[PDB]
Amino acid sequence: IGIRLTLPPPKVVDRWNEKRAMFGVYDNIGILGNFEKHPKELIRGPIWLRGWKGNELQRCIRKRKMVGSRMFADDLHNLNKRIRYLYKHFNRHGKFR
Amino acid sequence: LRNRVTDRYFRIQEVLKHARHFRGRKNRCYRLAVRTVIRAF
């Protein structure tokens, strides 16, 4: 009967954490810093999806073309299979044409 | 699993409380008790 017999340990949450108190700063660095930077030069993540949004077929095609040369070998073979699967799904299957 | 269902004990007990006075396995096991509670309703 998967429900816990004791109530879980308490969630303290620091609303005035340094991450939360300064969240949002320099999100507007372009429009009031004479446009020397874009706000997408603040985003920090994988090198292939900085300032770029796409679905899973657009993402794996872009990750392969940008970072596939230095990807691990059993991890690259999963990417080519995934692109070959999401090609077949997005181009051949679905309710709408 | 990102989010799974924790409230499922309380959803079983909305249907099992209406079946508590039944006979056999239709008061305990939810899968039989939901078809009799519906038919009783």
Partner: peptide, 26 residues
């Protein structure tokens, strides 16, 4: 261990009700 507070809070208050249907106070 499924995370979350609210079901564990409901179930804690529905076991107190069972504590009063087994051990009711004078």
């Amino acid at each position: 261990v499924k995370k979350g507070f609210r079901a564990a809070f409901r179930f804690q208050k529905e076991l107190e009700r069972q504590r009063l249907l087994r051990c009711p106070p004078p």
